[PDB]
Design a protein around this ligand. Structure first.
Ligand code: CD4
Ligand code: BCL
Ligand code: V7N
Ligand code: V7N
Ligand code: V7N
Ligand code: V7N
Ligand code: V7N
Ligand code: V7N
Ligand code: V7N
Ligand code: V7N
Ligand code: V7N
Ligand code: LMT
Ligand code: LMT
Lengths: 48, 273, 71, 39, 176, 60, 39, 49, 40, 48, 56, 40, 60, 39, 60, 39, 49, 40, 49, 39, 39, 39
């Protein structure tokens, strides 16, 4: 299964995977903050 | 088809963009990369003008009128049915006119000519860009542009003139008119002189640079010379468009009163206030 | 910090600097002379409390407009 | 580009990093589910 | 085959490709009007219109201009191609039409149309050499010859001007 | 049919084709975006029972 | 200039790309039709 | 019947057939969702009262 | 250039096999659909 | 069955398939979120 | 497939593609920015129920 | 150019394996979805 | 990947990149400065709930 | 000119870069659609 | 990082940079001088709480 | 004409400068969002 | 794992990591000050009536 | 140029050490923050 | 750890660090003056009625 | 055209000159902010 | 550029400069906390 | 052309020239400030 990496450049694989993960995590967090009402409840805990 | 001396000149090279890919001819026309972009913008801009005529009140050629948006839209794109279409056509026109000049630069390079022709045409592009980009931008709304319609743009010219009560008094306009009129005189003189030496009365030898030099000196009292008359024509013709662009860009963005009262400074010089 | 005087000819820099400073000085003087607060030829003798100050707020009446109506 | 030998070695780290990521994410989701379950 | 060029491919409107050296053969911007009349141009009274200045003592350099004679000519490759031996003048409309250049490191003298020369600093100051941006000092050796040194034909004018015209495309190219 | 590529240079027929399709696609979108029924940026969320339909004047 | 073999090879791609483009356009028209019919 | 294929690159055949099948299947589903009132009955099952 | 009669002969085998497989699955889909919401 | 892959490029295949899957999965989720009323019921649970 | 790059130099196509996509992106943004529904700089904080619809 | 018949055989094994894995995981997902919110 | 700089002269690319970014930045700043919501020179000290908002949809 | 193996190399990058761009754009539309749907 | 100065002549870049910065500074000063809140020649002596502020959201 | 090792070291700065630019812009946007959010 | 650093320059690594950390830390503080209502409680503590 | 395998092995030791140091200090910071203002 | 400095210029390092510290310190003070209500309480101590 | 050592010497002045200007400009903004804040 | 031997000595000053700066700041924060505590 | 000694001796006059000018301008500003402050 490893030989799919043959002829690639590993620093490009790590660049593509790094770019994907950073994007995917940020999309998931801004989505999740919408659905789960957090940090909104945190902000409401400490307010005036 | 080719002129009987042409084939010899149809070499590669001189392109500014795209290398050899577009470096070919279509009938008489040279193509090149900016040939391709010219035809793109010409086709799109024309078909949108046809659409503007279709959704307008008439197909009569003289009466078709694709107007800019209301001033309230400022520098935004209006709804297409409310002047937005005029904005897209304006972007097409700019793209076409720019491509045309850059295509002329490729043609001139391929023939070993100087760049004089692209730069001369730049003077017309400058005047257009002043009318539809720069002056409307300085006024803060694209709706200050002129409408695209054969007589409806003359209604715009009329009304813009009378926005300053008596537009003849615009000082830059007087200069621009003087260039346009002097250019037409110079063109008549140069055309007549060359034709009259090359086409003398029947049974007379073909004339010479000396005869046209002598006659020109009798007309103006000095000898312009062969290079000089072409320099003068280019100076007058391009200078006319440059002074045209000045005269409209000062009207509104810089001067907003009537043009007659601009001349108040001349009446108030301290030698005779 | 002298090496700049080999990087550029002092005559051209000297002329360019003097040209810049003269132009800037004229611009700032005429911007001031055109202002209300600093039109010193007419009002230079006024005390600092008497000199004009720009409004903290312009005035209005609802029925009045500086511009005519339209579109 | 990479040899079969480099591919063999690189793949091992890639698999390991992927499994570590999934394991950490599994703990994260178990915490989130206990905190605010979503079904 | 002596034919100077061939089509780049069989499609309509394709470019031609030169076979030999385009500057010598005269192809593209190096080409000249090959059927042009091989006779001198004439003044109204019928003298030769373009002649070396030594043949008409009426003409002289305007006082306070530099005389370019004896200056070096600097080619496109910054090499010294030669030095100006003589000026040729237009007698119908008084101006310098050609510099004549004694070639450096060669026997031959060649004409140089003044449209292709420029002064350092565009003549305002210095004026200690001439610049020929369009061809290399090697290519100066191949500039076409006039049949005689006292006159130039319309064909020879076309040939010489076409040589310097082609340089801006072909001077720095292996196409030779 | 492939012999059309001997009559014309495929390198520049393809440019002409892609250019044609670009101009035609842009024209059709601008024509629709000018219309009332298909001005989809403003009104695309309307269902078909609310979408504009043009008629002539009722001509009493 | 290309051989008649290369012409056949190129023509195969040109037909296939045309068909693919027409397929995409057909789905786009049927999406557009279902959203807001024009007849 | 197999002689049909002889002129042809199998990747072109697969590309053409794969295009057609994606097209037909999508058109059929878009059409069928209109006629059968599904997923509209699904959406009504779970919509907020 | 394309396929000889020999590889075309085996390509045809996969083409007919894949087609029959697709038609079988589609038959099951229609049987399920018909039992769920008949359309005639 | 396998020899359909002859003359192809493995990375082009995995790029094409990978991108198709991303497109399909995104379409399916956005559609499914519409039909199934989720995360809308999740959002309503923890909203205030 | 890859022989397209034997006809068109990929060094040049890739530049023309960047030029095309940059202009297209700018045109689509300026269209949306000037609409009522998608004037996001003025109204982007409105909820999707509050956002304008071009009915009349 | 491109893959040999050997590479094609070897690649096909992983291609089929990855596909079956993906379909297996999707099968679990649908069983969970169905038991959560049936759609017929 | 660094071999991309063999395709293009980096000296040329950097000049194009800086130009594009400089024009883009000026265009975005000018768009915002011309807006109501973000005309920050005149109104930057307003709090977020005091800052202008564009019109909503009509109620019916 | 360019050799067919350079063309086959570049085609790999071009396909991957094109499809990666389409993937990023599809996510941008998913965000825009979630924020304010246009149908 | 200094090898950037092999790609570009510093005699060019210095003149380019100073030309850019002078223009950018003059633009920002005249933008501020043309504003109401920062028309500092006329109104500079106003305290920060007295200086103009642009229109808020009116709810009206 | 740049060598491949010159390109190798150049690219490292180009990546670094791009990352630095994106970092500063990311803070600039988060500051702007905290001051006056646009969604 | 250290093989990953081969061919790189340490100054570029430390530049990249350094810039990333500055970014993330600044963002996390700007965000945290919004949610936790600090320094706002500090400001309200010492503010003049 | 570019870092060798020998140099990378040395560099990696500092990089791991610095990363652990950073995470340790951040762990203290979160403990203090949690006891000051718990966010769940 | 010292090997990080190899190849660098000491004066660039000191120039960059110094400019950072100036920027950070200025930001921190104008921020802190806002939160801590100082020198505002100092001015109110000595201001005239 | 710069040598290595010439470029490297110039880069020292160029960095410090740039940073010195930004430091001065940051004080100018501090003063301007204390006079009339824009947020 | 800077040699290892210079770097060794440079590092020793840079760390002692840093530690001194942190010491002064730690006293500043101790004083500030005793004047106006912020938690 | 300009020598390094010429530059050095020129710089002396250039700096006293600039300093004298700044001295006069700053006295001129403080007169203006005493007459009519702009803040
Ligand atoms: C108001 C005051 C100021 C107003 C100011 C007005 C100024 C007008 C200036 C323009 C006029 C000259 C244009 C011209 O000659 O172009 C060359 C072309 C072809 O002839 P050729 O060049 O000698 O030979 C080449 C050709 O035989 C073979 O070439 P090739 O095989 O390589 O290429 C294919 C052919 C195909 O032909 C065409 O595609 C052209 C068809 C359209 C021609 C329209 C000309 C404009 C008519 C205007 C008068 C009126 C028409 C109603 O050739 C070409 O590719 C040639 C392309 C030439 C493109 C020229 C486009 C000019 C557009 C001008 C628009 C003017 C708008 C005002 O000529 C023609 O086709 C015939 C034109 C004859 C002059 C028009 C006289 C009309 C008199 C009244 C009607 C007579 C009825 C019999
Ligand atoms: C001269 C070679 C180096 C340099 C060497 C030093 C040294 C050595 C010291 C500093 C110090 C400082 N430097 Mg310095 N620094 C340089 C360039 C700069 C630049 C810049 C725009 O390039 C800036 C903003 C700074 C900023 C700073 C401050 C953060 C700090 C406090 C003094 C001060 O305000 O100095 C403003 C800066 C200047 C006017 C120019 C630099 C030279 C002058 C003479 C000041 C620093 C020397 C200082 C007086 C030494 C005193 C003796 C020691 C305490 C034993 N440096 C140049 C490139 N810098 C001091 C520090 O760390 O304090 C905590 C310190 O001891
Ligand atoms: C909200 O609504 C919607 C959005 C719709 C919801 C739905 C969202 C969906 C569908 C999400 C799907 C997500 C997904 C799908 O697959 C997510 C997939 C995630 C995956 C796979 C993550 C993998 C992470 C892998 C990591 C971290 C690997 C690190 C490797 C390291 C560290 C080793 C590096 C190499 C070394 C050290 C060796 C060098 C040697 C060399 C060079 C040598 O030796 O030469
Ligand atoms: C407002 O309403 C108004 C507007 C008024 C109403 C009216 C509208 C009208 C009149 C419309 C007319 C429309 C029309 C009429 O015909 C439209 C016709 C459209 C057509 C024909 C479209 C064709 C598309 C073809 C495509 C996309 C081909 C793609 C090919 C590809 C991808 C392969 C490329 C090659 C490769 C990869 C390798 C080559 C091998 C090589 C080199 C080798 O092996 O060497
Ligand atoms: C709603 O209103 C309206 C719309 C009007 C309603 C009406 C609609 C209508 C009229 C619909 C008509 C539909 C239709 C009509 O025909 C539909 C026709 C459908 C058909 C034919 C489907 C066929 C599918 C075939 C498949 C899946 C084959 C797959 C093969 C595979 C996988 C193997 C590939 C080969 C290999 C592996 C060998 C390589 C060997 C090599 C390389 C070697 O050996 O070298
Ligand atoms: C909502 O309304 C509407 C939208 C209408 C509803 C309708 C929707 C419809 C109709 C959907 C249809 C979906 C569909 C089909 O029908 C979908 C088809 C999906 C498929 C097929 C998925 C396949 C996934 C396969 C994977 C993940 C494989 C991974 C393989 C790996 C990792 C191995 C890589 C290779 C190696 C290691 C080789 C090494 C050797 C080498 C290199 C060597 O040896 O050289
Ligand atoms: C309402 O508004 C209106 C406007 C009216 C509405 C309508 C709009 C319409 C009609 C729009 C149409 C859009 C359209 C149509 O097709 C849009 C088509 C878009 C397309 C095709 C996008 C393609 C993008 C491709 C990209 C980004 C590729 C990137 C590649 C990269 C990065 C790799 C580079 C190579 C490398 C690195 C290798 C070098 C070699 C190396 C290193 C070596 O050899 O070593
Ligand atoms: C109104 O709203 C509208 C506007 C309409 C909406 C908007 C719409 C659109 C379309 C937006 C588009 C955005 C966009 C799209 O691409 C944006 C793209 C942005 C990009 C790519 C930014 C890239 C920045 C990169 C930088 C800064 C690099 C710096 C590099 C440096 C510093 C190092 C230089 C080299 C040195 C120092 C020496 C090296 C060594 C050498 C030489 C040696 O050692 O020899
Ligand atoms: C609020 O809503 C949202 C934002 C959504 C919430 C979510 C946020 C998210 C998703 C955050 C994610 C954060 C994250 C990861 O996931 C964050 C990752 C953090 C990391 C990795 C930190 C690493 C720090 C490492 C440091 C400091 C290293 C220091 C090194 C030192 C001191 C030694 C250097 C010495 C050398 C080099 C000398 C040797 C040279 C040698 C030998 C030589 O030269 O030879
Ligand atoms: C309010 O809201 C927000 C803003 C969000 C709140 C949050 C803020 C945050 C997160 C702040 C973080 C700050 C921070 C993070 O690390 C701060 C880090 C600060 C640091 C590192 C300070 C370091 C100072 C170092 C000094 C002074 C060194 C002096 C060295 C000297 C004098 C020796 C010089 C060299 C010599 C003598 C040469 C020897 C030989 C040579 C040359 C030879 O021999 O050749
Ligand atoms: C509201 O209004 C708006 C406009 C909007 C507001 C904004 C305004 C803005 C943006 C302003 C910006 C200002 C600025 C920015 O840099 C201003 C910068 C000003 C500067 C640099 C001034 C420098 C002056 C230096 C002088 C005068 C030097 C004189 C030297 C002399 C006399 C010596 C000559 C040599 C001699 C005698 C002998 C040499 C030796 C020789 C020959 C030998 O020894 O051989
Ligand atoms: C190819 C890449 C594509 C990337 C994605 C780009 C966007 C394309 C989206 C296509 C799918 C849309 O799917 C459709 O989403 C809308 C969003 O209002 C749902 O609409 C329904 O649910 C949503 C919540 O999710 C409600 O806000 C809405 O009022 C209601 O009508 C539909 O029930 C669903 O069928
Ligand atoms: C446009 C910006 C958006 C992101 C765009 C890119 C996102 C996806 C990147 C995935 C990276 C891996 O993708 C893969 O990279 C390798 C090199 O590593 C490319 O490989 C290519 O170059 C290598 C080496 O020069 C050759 O041996 C190979 O034959 C050729 O295909 C693959 O063709 C590509 O599929």
């Amino acid at each position: 299964m490893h030989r799919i990496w043959m002829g690639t450049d590993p620093h490009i694989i790590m660049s593509a995977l790094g770019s994907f993960l950073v994007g995917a995590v940020l999309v998931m967090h801004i989505w999740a903050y919408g659905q789960f009402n957090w940090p909104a409840t945190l902000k409401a805990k400490y307010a005036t | 088809a080719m002129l009987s001396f042409e084939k010899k000149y149809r070499v590669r090279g001189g392109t500014l963009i795209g290398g050899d890919l577009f470096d070919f001819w279509f009938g008489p026309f040279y193509v090149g990369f900016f040939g391709v972009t010219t035809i793109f913008f010409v086709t799109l801009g024309t078909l949108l003008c046809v659409w503007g005529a279709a959704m307008g009140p008439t197909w009569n050629l003289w009466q078709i009128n694709i107007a800019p948006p209301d001033l309230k839209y400022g520098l935004g794109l209006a709804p297409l049915r409310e002047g937005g279409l005029w904005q897209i056509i304006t972007l097409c026109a700019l793209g076409a006119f720019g491509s045309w000049a850059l295509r002329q630069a490729e043609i001139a390079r391929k023939l070993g000519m100087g760049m004089h022709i692209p730069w001369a045409y730049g003077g017309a592009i400058l005047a257009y860009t002043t009318l539809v980009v720069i002056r409307p931008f300085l006024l803060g709304a694209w709706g200050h542009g002129f409408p695209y319609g054969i007589f409806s743009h003359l209604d715009w010219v009329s009304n813009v003139g009378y926005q300053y009560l008596h537009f003849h008094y615009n000082p830059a306009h007087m200069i621009a008119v003087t260039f346009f009129f002097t250019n037409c005189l110079a063109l008549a003189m140069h055309g007549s002189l060359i034709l009259s030496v090359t086409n003398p009365p029947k049974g007379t030898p073909t004339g010479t640079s000396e005869q046209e030099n002598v006659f020109f000196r009798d007309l103006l009292g000095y000898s312009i010379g062969a290079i000089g008359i072409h320099r003068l024509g280019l100076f007058l013709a391009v200078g006319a468009a440059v002074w045209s662009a000045i005269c409209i860009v000062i009207s509104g963005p810089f001067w907003t009163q009537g043009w007659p009262e601009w001349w108040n400074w001349w009446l108030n010089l301290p030698i005779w206030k | 910090m002298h090496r700049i005087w080999l990087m550029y000819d002092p005559r051209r820099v000297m002329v360019a600097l003097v040209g810049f400073l003269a132009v800037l000085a004229l611009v700032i003087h005429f911007v001031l002379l055109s202002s209300q607060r600093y039109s010193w030829i007419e009002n230079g003798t006024l005390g600092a409390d008497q000199a004009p100050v720009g409004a903290s707020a312009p005035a209005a009446a609802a029925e009045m407009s500086p511009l005519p109506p339209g579109r | 580009g990479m040899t079969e030998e480099e591919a063999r070695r690189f793949h091992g780290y890639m698999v390991t990093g992927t499994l570590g990521y999934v394991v950490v994410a599994s703990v994260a989701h178990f915490l989130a589910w206990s905190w605010r379950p979503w079904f | 085959s002596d034919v100077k060029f061939v089509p780049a491919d069989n499609y309509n409107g394709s470019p031609i490709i030169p076979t030999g050296n385009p500057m010598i053969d005269g192809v593209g911007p190096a080409s000249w009007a090959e059927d042009r009349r091989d006779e001198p141009d004439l003044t109204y009274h019928g003298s030769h219109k373009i002649v070396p200045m030594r043949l008409d003592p009426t003409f002289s350099i305007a006082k306070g201009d530099p005389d370019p004679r004896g200056l070096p000519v600097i080619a496109a490759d910054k090499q010294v191609a030669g030095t100006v031996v003589e000026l040729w003048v237009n007698r119908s409309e008084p101006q310098v039409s050609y510099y004549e250049v004694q070639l450096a490191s060669g026997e031959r003298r060649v004409l140089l149309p003044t449209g292709y020369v420029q002064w350092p600093n565009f003549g305002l100051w210095g004026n200690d050499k001439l610049l020929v941006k369009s061809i290399t000092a090697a290519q100066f050796a191949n500039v076409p010859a006039t049949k005689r040194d006292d006159q130039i034909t319309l064909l020879e004018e076309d040939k010489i001007c076409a040589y310097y015209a082609g340089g801006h495309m072909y001077a720095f190219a292996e196409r030779s």
